[PDB]
Enzyme design. Structure first.
Site, PDB file in Angstrom:
ATOM      1  N   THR A 113       0.732  -1.342  -0.179  1.00  0.00           N
ATOM      2  CA  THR A 113       0.348  -0.017  -0.359  1.00  0.00           C
ATOM      3  C   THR A 113       1.251   1.469  -0.052  1.00  0.00           C
ATOM      4  O   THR A 113       1.616   1.344   0.652  1.00  0.00           O
ATOM      5  CB  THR A 113      -0.680  -0.059   0.453  1.00  0.00           C
ATOM      6  OG1 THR A 113      -2.657  -0.575   1.419  1.00  0.00           O
ATOM      7  CG2 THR A 113      -1.434   1.439   1.531  1.00  0.00           C
TER       8      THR A 113
HETATM    9  C1  LIG Z   1      -7.396  -2.622   0.899  1.00  0.00           C
HETATM   10  C2  LIG Z   1      -6.640  -0.889   1.542  1.00  0.00           C
HETATM   11  C3  LIG Z   1      -5.544  -1.483   2.598  1.00  0.00           C
HETATM   12  C4  LIG Z   1      -4.198  -0.902   2.595  1.00  0.00           C
HETATM   13  C5  LIG Z   1      -4.005  -1.747   2.300  1.00  0.00           C
HETATM   14  C6  LIG Z   1      -1.857  -1.912   1.201  1.00  0.00           C
HETATM   15  O1  LIG Z   1      -1.093  -1.812   1.638  1.00  0.00           O
HETATM   16  N1  LIG Z   1      -2.594  -2.893   3.235  1.00  0.00           N
HETATM   17  C7  LIG Z   1      -2.742  -4.725   3.467  1.00  0.00           C
HETATM   18  O2  LIG Z   1      -3.059  -4.984   1.903  1.00  0.00           O
HETATM   19  C8  LIG Z   1      -2.907  -4.996   4.792  1.00  0.00           C
HETATM   20  C9  LIG Z   1      -0.832  -4.599   4.750  1.00  0.00           C
HETATM   21  C10 LIG Z   1      -1.143  -5.180   6.556  1.00  0.00           C
HETATM   22  C11 LIG Z   1       0.946  -4.929   6.823  1.00  0.00           C
HETATM   23  C12 LIG Z   1      -1.746  -4.647   7.674  1.00  0.00           C
HETATM   24  N2  LIG Z   1      -3.449  -6.374   3.951  1.00  0.00           N
HETATM   25  C13 LIG Z   1      -4.127  -7.027   4.869  1.00  0.00           C
HETATM   26  O3  LIG Z   1      -4.969  -6.019   5.934  1.00  0.00           O
HETATM   27  C14 LIG Z   1      -4.277  -8.211   5.170  1.00  0.00           C
HETATM   28  C15 LIG Z   1      -6.056  -8.837   4.478  1.00  0.00           C
HETATM   29  C16 LIG Z   1      -5.979  -9.683   4.186  1.00  0.00           C
HETATM   30  C17 LIG Z   1      -7.906  -9.773   4.057  1.00  0.00           C
HETATM   31  C18 LIG Z   1      -5.727  -9.868   2.318  1.00  0.00           C
HETATM   32  N3  LIG Z   1      -3.405  -9.038   5.488  1.00  0.00           N
HETATM   33  C19 LIG Z   1      -3.886  -9.264   6.990  1.00  0.00           C
HETATM   34  C20 LIG Z   1      -2.860 -10.523   7.275  1.00  0.00           C
HETATM   35  O4  LIG Z   1      -4.409  -8.730   7.704  1.00  0.00           O
END
Ligand SMILES: CCCC[C@@H](C=O)NC(=O)[C@H](CC(C)C)NC(=O)[C@H](CC(C)C)NC(C)=O
Ligand SMILES: CCCC[C@@H](C=O)NC(=O)[C@H](CC(C)C)NC(=O)[C@H](CC(C)C)NC(C)=O
Ligand SMILES: CCCC[C@@H](C=O)NC(=O)[C@H](CC(C)C)NC(=O)[C@H](CC(C)C)NC(C)=O
Ligand SMILES: CCCC[C@@H](C=O)NC(=O)[C@H](CC(C)C)NC(=O)[C@H](CC(C)C)NC(C)=O
Ligand SMILES: CCCC[C@@H](C=O)NC(=O)[C@H](CC(C)C)NC(=O)[C@H](CC(C)C)NC(C)=O
Ligand SMILES: CCCC[C@@H](C=O)NC(=O)[C@H](CC(C)C)NC(=O)[C@H](CC(C)C)NC(C)=O
Ligand SMILES: CCCC[C@@H](C=O)NC(=O)[C@H](CC(C)C)NC(=O)[C@H](CC(C)C)NC(C)=O
Ligand SMILES: CCCC[C@@H](C=O)NC(=O)[C@H](CC(C)C)NC(=O)[C@H](CC(C)C)NC(C)=O
Lengths: 202, 202, 202, 202, 202, 202, 202, 202
Positions: C1
């Site tokens: 992100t």
């Molecule tokens: C969709 C908007 C959120 C932004 C997006 C970009 O980084 N965030 C993310 O992808 C965050 C990053 C972590 C480090 C909190 N990912 C997450 O929150 C994922 C969610 C899954 C449903 C795929 N992973 C976990 C372990 O919860």
């Protein structure tokens, strides 16, 4: 990281991508992960960059010296056994590395996957390594057939590593491939690979 | 800390800022983080001051002795391999340091980024290091082109480390730059740098 | 992100990429990270997907209800304060999310960056968010000028997020942009973005 | 962060810088850290941005309501006692904040330094707060005299916060100052401050 | 503990207070923290009393032996490098000490601040050390000018350490000062210091 | 912190110094640690500033309300029992405070030392409290006699706290004293104390 | 445990009590805590019984051998330096002991307080050691004057250790005292001490 | 566990295998992991058996009641939002489950992947879930094309899950598949599946 290796009816193929990371930081888009041990032997490295590089040097030097001294090229088995022992000796503070050592020798064609503790599995057909291995295994186990030839095998390899780059953020940036036929030990060059994956989507 | 290194068509450029910290305490506004190893080889140090300074001494002494003994200057590759091995030998209580070793030699132009465990990536164009590296990478990856010349490369370098100082409280206070052309190993002096970043905002 | 936001002389620009990860696993190549709160107000979300999505719903609903009930559109300040309080109330088991709430309102143009604990900084010009923010800040702090107009600001935005995708394996896959002028709240569509970054390298 | 407060013979002076950090990441170069509570009362906030901001709103609202209801302005003692109790009530999961609440009231001139647990020290002359306070205390305890007048006290304040910015990487970017005389509650504006520290070095 | 060191146009000045503590227990009101290494070289010690004392002895003996053997006095750089290496060699169970080694030598005037791991910063003007350093830095960075002369520098030093004793309960009880001019290596004696801080408040 | 209390033949004496610390940081040189509960009852507070301050308020208010409601002044025993119960009720997350509550009442003269858990010891003669208590106890147990009169007792108190400031870096900056005779509840003022310790050394 | 040492105008006095504990268990009412090193040198030991006893033997033996070999008595400085080095060499598994080594020698009169890590403070007048030291310091700092003579100094010593026994349950059972004048090294015997503290209360 | 879901041009396909494990213990060869929510809506469950089964019941019941009460079938978006919120509400002790909810509705065709914290990604084409997902993703990302039709999509699905069972010991034993066209919601039955994977190798 993701590297594959397949034993074809007419040789051996090995490939890897070029990414090196430290967390989410992309440290390198062109890391070298494929090494030449002997004339018909290659090695792919997955794991700690420093550890892999260190071990690679040792491996090479010892393969060389073996030949220069005994006037015989070392068999992949010899190099694999050598490496296993070294790895295992350090089993209580192991080198975080997953190695792939294979090629063609007087005994035939073969590939060995070796872990930090020197656990070596003799790959009789398909093998993937690295953070992307599981995705790569997907296509490898789908399209592989023992009768596959090294020429389509390199396509298969690029195919698998291409899939893996799509779901492993730790993989990517490009891909090296190596064919070990007997009449040759060939390394495809960006151009040729770029043209092989061109029949895919990128 | 933040240091950058770029391989140009006509040489190599390396730069760093002058801040040294211990937490939020600014211990130094003029720390030295750029060292000369050979006539056309420099090294930037990021990480533990004590460890980096210690390692720098070793690196220099060994480079010197190499030449004095073999009457040949050591190639960056040789110094990089040397340094890698040393770093990796201490892998279980590593020297917390990120090194940049590069310059020009019989093999060409190149830069190596080496980590605590002796993992060395061969920088074929751009590289940043230190707590500010990620910001510096921003501008570097934006304005860099392989055809860039050392002269505008030093501007680029100052440019990147300038952005970095704006978002990394651990960076700042000033900036050293070094140009390694072949006809020279030049170090810009405060005046010249102050005048190069003058075309920016400070 | 990685998401950016810039306040131009003639409006507001906000952009984000489309990657969603869980470790090195790329879970999504098209995650939505930009939401519309009011007619001239947007919000970008970095952090926990679930947490962000949940909060997004709450934010919208309360913005709507505010207007429907008071027949006035809520100011960004009002939405930012509302969100800060909500976030802080849960300070001992916070919603892991970094929010960007901005647009144009009776008070002018503004952007707010809000953290898990409801700490809100009023962005008077430039701002980046997410695992790639530091790289993005690089180019943003390099090419930004207060006189920049929304039209070139969307280019800058694409520019920064593009650099970030190059060094943050957690960022990537594409990029959404949004222009908030006054006469409009525009969202560029893949085609238009793909054509804006076309003047770069991809 | 670094904020100072001094009780002069003719009033009260309070100042802070504008930096907001998260690790070494400079999140803001213009964070607001000085709030007006009553006509002749101000407050500086050091600590968690979200926590401080949250508390600031509560403080203001309650000061207001106090006056509107009792038609008397609340004394600094009252607000300080109020805030102490609130802070201490949350002693087992305290708001990570260091507050400075002072000004002029029917009781005289005074400043209160309040910690997370609601421990309030009545500053009868000099006081500094934040990551830079210890450096600021250096000059404050050097040049302060009870007869100092608010006009030179604001110079002194800028002086101290300027020193602190030199050794605390968490401080910097600029400085707000506020004079509380009686005939006025004045806030210097960038121009005026920039001209006051101009008699120093920047 | 708190010790300062400043390089003047006509020499070097170093000072420390006399307090030694173990928790809040004031173990000593007259600890020695300033040692003479060579004729025009002094050293101040902050940290573990036992570690500092042990190191001081080694330092002295080696400086002596150096001169007796080479019939040349050792430069501060040589002593600083010597001490760095020793400190760093014990980097995994370091000597908890902050050292200040400076004076005048064939190379000029200089001071070195060295940490437990042997990280040495070359002080080209101002430097403080110890639990009170941050407050001492306040006045030092306020009143110092490169043109300052050793004579007013000793006043400045007393000034700084005096402020520090006011906010660091770990500092205090008195102050030693040392002037290293060239025509002399002078140590002020209680009387003289007591009369220099008399122009202050105690 | 260090506070003493002695029951004389003609009254009660209580004293404390004025230092408030957070680590080695001297946060205050004039903290208040002596409170008036009733006309002939005082209280000294050692421990957490915020906890002590909070408790002090409750104590006062309840003592007041007691008298206003019952038209009788509360005995020290009643206040001590009251405070004990309150403290003990919070025994699993106690208020980190050491209290001294004494004076003269219908039952006689007495002092109570109360700890975080509400354990109250009835001091029939001598008592010290705080980080400096152990040193203060030294002189108190040396020079005290039950026949001592309040007038020499205040000297004794100053004497003890003066010694304590000499070995407890957490104590110091000055000293408040209070005499509770019957015909009066007197508080000495800086001048008078400064003149009483003048017969000592400072 | 509690031991004191004071440097008088005409000599040195050192005293200790006789208690040895293990938790609340009083293991000994007559432990020896004062040793004679040379003719005019004594040592008191606080800390681990076994560690102190072990070190005491080493100290004695080495002092002896020193003299027998060099036909000169070792100075207290020599023994103190010797002991420091020994203590510090074991800094990572230190001997839990607090030593006091002093007496009269060619250099004058002095006392050294040495800690587990070999940190030695040169006592120019007063010093206490052990669990009771803080109370003892109370009276010592109250009644001591540089002109005090050994004869009243032994009274003072008994006085201090007597106070300490009143507030340190780990101290008590009796007290040894030693006078080191020059014409003598005297040890008072129970009778004489019992008669000196008789002028007190027991 | 491994489940896949793909959005074709003519509908939706979802499949899973039948293995349930507890460590290496194969608890079940025929676990149900595919549920029908509405007429044209299905859900696959990966994660905790008990958690998934519990959530499944809740999901079904709520979908039903929704329709029975509003006489409209709920959209996948509504069920996905409903589920997200439920999951997120329990974010501090989440239901360890990965859900796939998709089918056809008034809004079109879609699939949602939802995690323990209620983070929902809208699958616009391909998606895998469970311990075998990474391998499955391999073939899915290799052979998928947006024009794929549900009929060949079910083959693809069986293909992917077949690869996965080959490298994930936690997957296997058989495979359920479900086609959601519009004219139908079809479930293949062992026979038909066994005959579809028959064109592969088992
Ligand atoms: C969709 C908007 C959120 C932004 C997006 C970009 O980084 N965030 C993310 O992808 C965050 C990053 C972590 C480090 C909190 N990912 C997450 O929150 C994922 C969610 C899954 C449903 C795929 N992973 C976990 C372990 O919860
Ligand atoms: C040159 C061969 C590198 C192979 C590549 C493939 O896996 N490996 C890597 O990139 C590994 C991955 C980590 C998890 C051990 N990266 C690393 O080892 C990095 C290397 C630095 C040189 C950037 N360091 C750390 C602490 O992770
Ligand atoms: C001359 C080399 C300094 C380079 C500079 C750039 O990163 N490094 C530094 O400033 C490092 C950073 C920390 C995170 C290891 N600082 C340090 O190593 C400091 C140095 C003291 C002299 C103040 N010490 C500690 C214990 O951290
Ligand atoms: C806006 C004024 C707040 C005062 C200012 C002064 O210290 N505080 C800060 O900048 C504090 C410092 C840390 C050490 C608690 N920073 C913070 O509170 C940041 C705030 C984010 C919005 C970037 N968060 C974290 C987890 O650190
Ligand atoms: C003797 C000169 C050294 C400087 C002086 C100033 O701070 N150092 C000290 O006072 C250090 C501080 C601690 C935190 C390492 N004190 C110490 O090392 C003490 C020394 C004993 C003789 C009382 N030991 C312990 C375990 O604390
Ligand atoms: C205000 C009168 C209380 C007595 C005074 C004397 O020791 N207490 C104190 O100074 C206590 C000591 C600590 C160890 C609980 N200090 C404190 O409670 C400080 C107070 C801040 C306002 C600086 N807080 C912290 C976290 O240390
Ligand atoms: C014989 C003189 C030794 C000095 C005397 C003074 O403190 N020390 C003691 O009495 C020490 C005190 C503890 C806290 C280390 N006691 C001890 O060392 C006891 C000794 C046993 C023989 C009973 N052991 C333990 C584990 O405590
Ligand atoms: C209804 C969905 C079941 C899918 C199946 C595939 O992975 N899941 C499972 O088998 C999960 C896996 C663990 C790692 C959460 N197993 C479980 O939840 C098992 C269930 C027992 C009835 C055997 N228990 C434990 C402690 O693991």
């Amino acid at each position: 990281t993701t590297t594959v290796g397949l034993v074809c009816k007419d040789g051996v193929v090995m490939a890897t991508e070029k990414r090196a990371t430290m967390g989410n930081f992309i440290a390198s888009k062109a890391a070298k992960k494929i090494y030449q041990i002997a004339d018909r032997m290659a090695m792919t490295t997955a794991g700690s960059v420093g550890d892999a590089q260190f071990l690679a040097r040792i491996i090479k030097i010892e393969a060389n010296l073996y030949e220069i001294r005994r006037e015989r090229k070392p068999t992949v088995r010899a190099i694999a056994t050598l490496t296993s022992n070294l790895l295992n000796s350090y089993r209580y503070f192991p080198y975080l590395v997953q190695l792939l050592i294979g090629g063609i020798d007087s005994e035939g064609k073969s590939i060995y996957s070796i872990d930090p503790i020197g656990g070596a599995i003799e790959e009789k057909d398909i093998v993937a390594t690295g953070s992307g291995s599981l995705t790569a295994y997907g296509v490898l186990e789908d399209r592989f057939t023992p009768e596959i030839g090294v020429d389509e095998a390199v396509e298969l390899a690029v195919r698998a590593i291409y899939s893996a780059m799509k779901r492993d953020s730790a993989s990517g940036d490009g891909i090296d491939v190596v064919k070990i036929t007997e009449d040759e030990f060939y390394q495809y060059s960006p151009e040729e690979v770029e043209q092989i994956l061109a029949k895919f989507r990128k």
